[PDB]
Short mmCIF file of C-alpha atoms in Angstrom, two decimals:
data_model
loop_
_atom_site.label_atom_id
_atom_site.label_comp_id
_atom_site.label_asym_id
_atom_site.label_seq_id
_atom_site.Cartn_x
_atom_site.Cartn_y
_atom_site.Cartn_z
CA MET A 1 -13.96 -30.06 26.35
CA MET A 2 -11.32 -31.52 29.20
CA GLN A 3 -9.52 -34.64 29.30
CA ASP A 4 -8.88 -37.19 32.48
CA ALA A 5 -5.37 -37.46 34.08
CA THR A 6 -2.61 -37.92 30.99
CA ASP A 7 -3.45 -41.83 30.29
CA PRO A 8 -0.22 -43.38 32.79
CA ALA A 9 0.20 -45.93 30.31
CA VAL A 10 0.35 -44.00 27.34
CA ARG A 11 2.73 -41.49 28.75
CA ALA A 12 5.50 -43.88 29.14
CA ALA A 13 4.75 -45.01 25.77
CA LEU A 14 5.49 -41.36 24.59
CA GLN A 15 8.33 -40.86 25.95
CA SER A 16 9.72 -44.49 24.49
CA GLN A 17 8.46 -46.23 21.13
CA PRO A 18 8.93 -44.40 18.04
CA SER A 19 6.73 -41.53 16.66
CA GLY A 20 6.38 -41.34 13.02
CA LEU A 21 7.17 -44.46 11.50
CA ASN A 22 6.90 -47.74 13.60
CA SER A 23 7.14 -50.21 10.35
CA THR A 24 6.04 -53.23 12.18
CA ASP A 25 3.52 -52.10 14.82
CA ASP A 26 1.57 -49.76 12.21
CA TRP A 27 2.37 -52.25 9.03
CA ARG A 28 -0.66 -51.95 7.28
CA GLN A 29 0.06 -48.30 7.42
CA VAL A 30 3.39 -48.27 6.11
CA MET A 31 2.08 -50.52 3.61
CA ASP A 32 -0.88 -48.78 2.77
CA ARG A 33 1.59 -45.77 2.19
CA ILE A 34 4.34 -47.48 0.10
CA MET A 35 1.90 -49.02 -2.29
CA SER A 36 1.02 -45.46 -3.21
CA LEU A 37 -2.46 -46.30 -1.65
CA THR A 38 -2.45 -42.90 0.64
CA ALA A 39 -5.05 -40.24 0.20
CA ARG A 40 -3.00 -37.44 0.94
CA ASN A 41 -0.43 -38.11 -2.23
CA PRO A 42 -0.07 -41.28 -4.20
CA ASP A 43 3.58 -41.24 -5.20
CA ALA A 44 5.11 -39.81 -1.76
CA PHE A 45 7.24 -43.12 -1.64
CA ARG A 46 8.04 -42.51 -5.69
CA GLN A 47 9.95 -38.97 -5.61
CA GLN A 48 11.58 -39.88 -2.19
CA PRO A 49 15.40 -40.95 -1.93
CA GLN A 50 16.01 -44.58 -3.64
CA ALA A 51 18.03 -45.75 -0.23
CA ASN A 52 15.55 -44.51 2.37
CA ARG A 53 12.61 -46.07 0.25
CA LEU A 54 14.60 -49.54 0.58
CA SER A 55 14.45 -49.03 4.54
CA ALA A 56 10.99 -48.98 4.34
CA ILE A 57 10.11 -52.17 1.58
CA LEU A 58 13.42 -54.09 3.82
CA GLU A 59 10.78 -53.35 7.54
CA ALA A 60 7.49 -53.39 6.62
CA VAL A 61 7.69 -56.60 3.93
CA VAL A 62 9.86 -58.24 6.55
CA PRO A 63 8.11 -57.77 10.05
CA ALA A 64 10.97 -56.69 12.82
CA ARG A 65 10.77 -57.39 16.32
CA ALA A 66 10.87 -54.09 18.24
CA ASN A 67 11.73 -53.95 22.16
CA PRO A 68 7.99 -53.75 24.18
CA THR A 69 9.30 -54.54 27.47
CA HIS A 70 10.82 -50.85 28.39
CA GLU A 71 7.21 -49.07 27.40
CA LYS A 72 5.24 -51.94 29.59
CA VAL A 73 7.68 -51.76 32.95
CA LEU A 74 7.56 -47.54 32.62
CA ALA A 75 4.21 -47.75 31.98
CA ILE A 76 3.58 -49.21 35.57
CA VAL A 77 6.48 -47.02 37.03
CA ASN A 78 5.06 -43.70 35.58
CA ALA A 79 1.49 -45.03 36.51
CA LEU A 80 3.19 -45.37 40.06
CA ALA A 81 4.19 -41.77 39.62
CA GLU A 82 0.51 -40.63 38.56
CA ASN A 83 -1.29 -42.94 41.73
CA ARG A 84 1.08 -41.68 43.47
CA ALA A 85 2.66 -44.58 44.42
CA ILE A 86 6.32 -43.48 44.52
CA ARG A 87 7.41 -39.80 44.11
CA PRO A 88 8.68 -38.22 41.00
CA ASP A 89 12.18 -37.94 41.38
CA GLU A 90 12.09 -42.01 42.59
CA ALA A 91 11.97 -42.35 38.78
CA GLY A 92 16.00 -43.60 38.74
CA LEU A 93 15.20 -46.70 41.19
CA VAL A 94 11.86 -48.32 40.72
CA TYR A 95 11.88 -48.12 37.02
CA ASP A 96 15.30 -50.02 37.03
CA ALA A 97 14.85 -52.23 40.51
CA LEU A 98 11.67 -53.99 39.02
CA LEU A 99 13.84 -54.52 35.68
CA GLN A 100 16.30 -55.91 37.69
CA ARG A 101 13.93 -58.04 38.77
CA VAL A 102 12.30 -58.97 35.68
CA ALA A 103 16.02 -59.49 34.95
CA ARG A 104 16.62 -62.53 37.22
CA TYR A 105 12.77 -63.38 36.58
CA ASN A 106 12.61 -62.51 32.77
CA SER A 107 10.98 -65.99 32.03
CA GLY A 108 8.15 -67.28 34.96
CA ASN A 109 4.80 -66.76 34.78
CA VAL A 110 5.12 -63.22 36.20
CA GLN A 111 5.36 -60.99 33.25
CA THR A 112 1.92 -62.69 32.04
CA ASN A 113 0.67 -61.16 34.84
CA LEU A 114 2.49 -57.84 34.85
CA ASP A 115 0.90 -56.84 31.43
CA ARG A 116 -2.54 -57.83 33.14
CA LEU A 117 -1.52 -56.13 35.75
CA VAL A 118 -0.34 -52.96 33.22
CA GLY A 119 -4.15 -52.62 32.12
CA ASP A 120 -5.12 -52.96 36.42
CA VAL A 121 -3.05 -50.43 37.20
CA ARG A 122 -3.87 -47.92 34.52
CA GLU A 123 -7.54 -48.42 35.25
CA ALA A 124 -6.36 -47.66 38.98
CA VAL A 125 -4.85 -44.14 37.95
CA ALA A 126 -8.27 -43.56 36.21
CA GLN A 127 -10.53 -45.07 38.66
CA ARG A 128 -8.99 -42.97 41.95
CA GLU A 129 -8.49 -39.98 39.42
CA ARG A 130 -12.75 -39.86 39.56
CA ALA A 131 -12.85 -41.08 43.05
CA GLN A 132 -10.60 -37.79 44.52
CA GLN A 133 -12.54 -35.81 42.63
CA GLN A 134 -15.66 -37.41 45.02
CA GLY A 135 -13.27 -37.43 48.15
CA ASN A 136 -16.72 -38.50 49.93
CA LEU A 137 -14.66 -41.78 50.58
CA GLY A 138 -12.07 -40.12 53.54
CA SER A 139 -15.48 -38.28 54.53
CA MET A 140 -18.62 -40.95 54.92
CA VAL A 141 -15.83 -43.84 56.67
CA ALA A 142 -15.40 -40.60 58.70
CA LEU A 143 -19.11 -39.70 59.39
CA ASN A 144 -19.73 -43.19 60.37
CA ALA A 145 -17.21 -42.91 63.48
CA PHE A 146 -19.35 -39.76 64.23
CA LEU A 147 -22.46 -41.14 63.90
CA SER A 148 -21.48 -44.46 66.02
CA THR A 149 -19.61 -42.52 68.91
CA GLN A 150 -22.23 -39.84 69.10
CA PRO A 151 -25.27 -40.29 70.43
CA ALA A 152 -27.87 -40.78 67.97
CA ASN A 153 -31.53 -39.32 68.74
CA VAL A 154 -31.91 -38.57 72.04
CA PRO A 155 -33.33 -35.08 72.38
CA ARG A 156 -35.62 -35.82 74.96
CA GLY A 157 -36.02 -32.21 75.57
CA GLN A 158 -37.76 -30.90 72.52
CA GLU A 159 -36.98 -32.88 69.16
CA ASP A 160 -35.61 -30.75 65.72
CA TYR A 161 -32.31 -32.94 65.74
CA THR A 162 -33.39 -35.88 63.53
CA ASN A 163 -34.05 -33.33 60.53
CA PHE A 164 -29.72 -32.39 61.43
CA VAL A 165 -29.03 -35.80 61.06
CA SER A 166 -29.77 -36.02 57.30
CA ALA A 167 -28.26 -32.32 57.31
CA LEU A 168 -24.42 -33.40 58.06
CA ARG A 169 -25.20 -36.32 55.58
CA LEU A 170 -26.09 -34.00 52.73
CA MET A 171 -22.61 -32.12 52.90
CA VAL A 172 -20.70 -34.88 52.45
CA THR A 173 -22.85 -35.83 49.28
CA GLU A 174 -23.07 -32.08 47.89
CA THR A 175 -19.68 -30.89 47.82
CA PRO A 176 -16.91 -34.23 47.84
CA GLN A 177 -13.63 -32.05 47.08
CA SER A 178 -11.66 -30.99 49.89
CA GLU A 179 -14.85 -31.75 52.21
CA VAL A 180 -12.83 -33.98 54.39
CA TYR A 181 -14.04 -35.27 58.08
CA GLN A 182 -10.57 -35.29 59.42
CA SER A 183 -10.17 -37.12 62.42
CA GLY A 184 -6.85 -35.91 64.09
CA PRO A 185 -7.47 -34.82 67.70
CA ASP A 186 -10.39 -37.05 68.72
CA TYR A 187 -13.39 -34.21 68.51
CA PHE A 188 -14.40 -34.73 65.18
CA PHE A 189 -14.10 -31.78 62.52
CA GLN A 190 -14.83 -30.59 59.23
CA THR A 191 -13.14 -28.45 56.30
CA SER A 192 -14.60 -26.78 53.61
CA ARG A 193 -12.11 -25.11 51.56
CA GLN A 194 -8.56 -26.22 50.05
CA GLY A 195 -6.93 -24.02 52.58
CA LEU A 196 -9.06 -24.57 55.81
CA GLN A 197 -10.42 -21.01 57.06
CA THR A 198 -13.27 -22.47 58.80
CA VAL A 199 -12.80 -25.51 60.22
CA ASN A 200 -14.53 -26.19 63.27
CA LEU A 201 -15.37 -29.02 66.07
CA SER A 202 -18.45 -30.80 65.32
CA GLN A 203 -17.90 -31.79 69.17
CA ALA A 204 -18.16 -28.16 69.67
CA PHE A 205 -21.65 -29.17 68.71
CA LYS A 206 -22.12 -31.10 72.10
CA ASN A 207 -22.96 -27.36 73.22
CA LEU A 208 -26.42 -27.72 71.29
CA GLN A 209 -27.60 -31.40 73.12
CA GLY A 210 -29.12 -28.86 76.00
CA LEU A 211 -30.35 -26.46 73.40
CA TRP A 212 -32.03 -28.53 71.07
CA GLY A 213 -35.62 -27.10 72.36
CA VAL A 214 -35.72 -24.18 74.54
CA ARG A 215 -38.50 -21.42 74.82
CA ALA A 216 -38.12 -18.43 72.39
CA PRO A 217 -38.60 -14.50 73.64
CA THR A 218 -39.14 -12.35 70.95
CA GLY A 219 -37.42 -11.25 67.46
CA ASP A 220 -34.18 -10.09 69.08
CA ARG A 221 -31.12 -12.20 69.73
CA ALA A 222 -32.55 -14.31 73.07
CA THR A 223 -32.03 -13.70 76.60
CA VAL A 224 -30.85 -17.60 76.62
CA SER A 225 -29.17 -17.89 73.28
CA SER A 226 -25.75 -16.19 74.22
CA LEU A 227 -24.14 -19.27 75.10
CA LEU A 228 -23.88 -20.47 71.38
CA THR A 229 -20.47 -20.75 70.92
CA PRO A 230 -18.89 -19.19 67.83
CA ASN A 231 -17.18 -22.57 67.13
CA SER A 232 -20.74 -24.24 67.05
CA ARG A 233 -22.17 -21.07 65.07
CA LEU A 234 -19.38 -21.88 62.08
CA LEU A 235 -21.00 -25.19 62.03
CA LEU A 236 -24.51 -23.82 62.04
CA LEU A 237 -23.44 -21.04 59.17
CA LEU A 238 -21.74 -24.00 56.98
CA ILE A 239 -24.71 -26.79 57.12
CA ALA A 240 -26.91 -23.49 56.01
CA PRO A 241 -26.63 -23.87 52.46
CA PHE A 242 -27.60 -27.17 52.54
CA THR A 243 -30.94 -27.31 54.88
CA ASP A 244 -33.18 -24.67 55.43
CA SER A 245 -36.85 -26.66 55.90
CA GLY A 246 -37.28 -28.86 58.57
CA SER A 247 -36.28 -27.51 61.61
CA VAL A 248 -38.96 -25.85 63.92
CA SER A 249 -38.15 -21.80 62.92
CA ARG A 250 -40.51 -20.50 65.37
CA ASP A 251 -39.12 -23.00 68.60
CA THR A 252 -35.90 -22.42 68.94
CA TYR A 253 -32.96 -21.34 67.39
CA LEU A 254 -31.97 -24.78 65.98
CA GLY A 255 -34.72 -23.59 63.50
CA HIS A 256 -34.80 -19.22 63.66
CA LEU A 257 -31.51 -18.60 63.48
CA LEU A 258 -30.77 -21.40 60.67
CA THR A 259 -33.59 -19.16 58.66
CA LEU A 260 -31.39 -16.20 59.89
CA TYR A 261 -28.43 -17.69 58.41
CA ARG A 262 -29.55 -17.84 55.02
CA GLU A 263 -30.46 -13.68 55.66
CA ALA A 264 -26.56 -13.82 56.21
CA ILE A 265 -26.18 -15.77 52.42
CA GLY A 266 -29.39 -14.09 51.41
CA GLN A 267 -27.78 -10.27 51.68
CA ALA A 268 -23.95 -11.99 50.21
CA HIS A 269 -24.53 -12.98 47.16
CA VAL A 270 -27.05 -9.88 46.11
CA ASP A 271 -24.15 -7.53 47.35
CA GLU A 272 -21.75 -10.13 45.24
CA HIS A 273 -23.57 -8.85 42.73
CA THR A 274 -23.30 -5.23 43.88
CA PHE A 275 -19.73 -5.31 44.55
CA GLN A 276 -18.97 -6.68 40.79
CA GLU A 277 -20.60 -3.91 38.86
CA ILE A 278 -19.56 -0.94 40.94
CA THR A 279 -15.89 -1.81 40.95
CA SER A 280 -16.20 -2.28 37.10
CA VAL A 281 -17.86 1.50 36.91
CA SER A 282 -14.07 2.69 37.65
CA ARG A 283 -13.80 4.44 34.45
CA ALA A 284 -16.18 6.95 35.03
CA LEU A 285 -15.69 7.02 38.86
CA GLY A 286 -12.15 7.28 38.97
CA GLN A 287 -11.55 6.83 42.91
CA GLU A 288 -10.70 3.94 45.43
CA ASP A 289 -14.86 3.81 46.09
CA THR A 290 -14.74 2.00 49.75
CA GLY A 291 -18.59 3.44 49.39
CA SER A 292 -19.01 -0.22 47.75
CA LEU A 293 -18.65 -1.86 51.05
CA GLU A 294 -19.65 1.41 53.13
CA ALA A 295 -23.13 0.58 51.20
CA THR A 296 -22.91 -3.08 51.95
CA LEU A 297 -22.17 -2.42 55.62
CA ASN A 298 -24.84 0.15 55.63
CA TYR A 299 -27.70 -2.70 54.24
CA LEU A 300 -26.96 -4.66 57.13
CA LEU A 301 -26.26 -2.16 59.82
CA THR A 302 -29.61 0.51 59.41
CA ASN A 303 -32.40 -2.62 59.05
CA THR B 1 47.21 -45.39 -12.24
CA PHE B 2 49.01 -42.87 -9.61
CA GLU B 3 51.20 -40.36 -10.88
CA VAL B 4 53.40 -37.59 -9.05
CA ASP B 5 56.43 -35.23 -9.89
CA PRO B 6 59.89 -37.31 -9.00
CA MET B 7 60.61 -38.56 -6.30
CA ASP B 8 63.84 -38.01 -3.90
CA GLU B 9 63.06 -38.70 -0.39
CA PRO B 10 61.24 -42.26 0.64
CA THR B 11 57.85 -41.24 1.19
CA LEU B 12 54.53 -42.62 2.37
CA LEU B 13 51.33 -41.44 0.00
CA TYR B 14 48.87 -41.06 2.31
CA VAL B 15 45.39 -41.73 0.33
CA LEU B 16 42.23 -41.60 2.06
CA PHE B 17 39.27 -43.82 0.73
CA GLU B 18 35.92 -41.84 1.97
CA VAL B 19 34.47 -44.80 4.47
CA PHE B 20 31.68 -44.30 7.16
CA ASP B 21 32.22 -45.20 10.48
CA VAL B 22 29.03 -44.65 12.91
CA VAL B 23 28.16 -45.91 16.74
CA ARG B 24 24.89 -45.87 18.65
CA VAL B 25 25.18 -45.52 22.34
CA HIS B 26 22.77 -47.80 24.20
CA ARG B 27 21.07 -48.01 27.74
CA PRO B 28 18.60 -50.44 28.31
CA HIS B 29 19.74 -50.78 32.09
CA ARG B 30 21.01 -47.91 34.15
CA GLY B 31 24.61 -48.22 34.35
CA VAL B 32 24.50 -51.12 31.49
CA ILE B 33 25.64 -50.04 27.85
CA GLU B 34 25.27 -52.11 24.63
CA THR B 35 28.02 -51.19 21.94
CA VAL B 36 28.15 -51.45 18.28
CA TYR B 37 30.32 -49.86 15.73
CA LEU B 38 30.12 -49.84 11.98
CA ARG B 39 32.84 -48.84 9.26
CA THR B 40 30.54 -50.07 6.11
CA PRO B 41 32.53 -48.95 2.84
CA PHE B 42 35.41 -51.11 4.64
CA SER B 43 33.55 -54.48 5.64
CA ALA B 44 32.72 -53.17 9.00
CA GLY B 45 29.52 -52.59 11.08
CA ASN B 46 26.60 -54.38 13.10
#
């Protein structure tokens, strides 16, 4: 089990308010401790020195108003650090700039809002932290711009593309984390990893609009399908762990190559379980076994 | 009821009473200091 982002209203409380005994806030906890009612040891208040004994009585029986503002205003500014509304080095300015703002306006209806906004801003950290795990929000809106600009449902050659419409939508829903459909240049493009080692254009996909339905030769790479760019080829291998059945595997490469993209993944996860064993058995071989990779090469070439 | 060995030159008998004077350095605002001192066994504090 794991925690959510360390509670932003509590992190700032951790650094300000008393830890052990706040005699006013934890009143019936000190009162329980002084009445010899605590289950740990009853006479923990009796065996204590007489002077600090009296300090517990004066503070608990007469509750003293402790300063609450600096654990409320800091609760906003540290949430401003976790929601990233300010930079971490900005904690010197905004903490006091708003304290100087409430120095001028201590006593309007604004601070009655402020503590209600404290509960709102602390929840906004918890809302966004669960929302950044699903980076769908900066992805689906971007795909809405892709679906509108690109002409949808126009394969007047042959139609297998209706299945492909949902295939791109499945990539948004299944993996959301680093999967951002960034619109930097006017061509749309999707990143798969946190460092973006396969971020091809979804407008390199515009090469497929004339190749949505053509004739198939035989079983070896086609006499025509050499036109398919390694840019668009990178996309079609990336949608392959998402959609398989739907596109016709016998009419054009939209389906025949998509089934063949599963052959690339099908070998990969087998060889993953192959490599994790031969590398693990290095005590009995005592060599840099590149034959683990050479057999992997042999299991792809000699078929 | 002090008593010393025979006096010749005019001298001040320096007597210290063990009193207790402590501070606390407050900072509610950055730049603004709130000052409070306390010598208790000498009717001083706050």
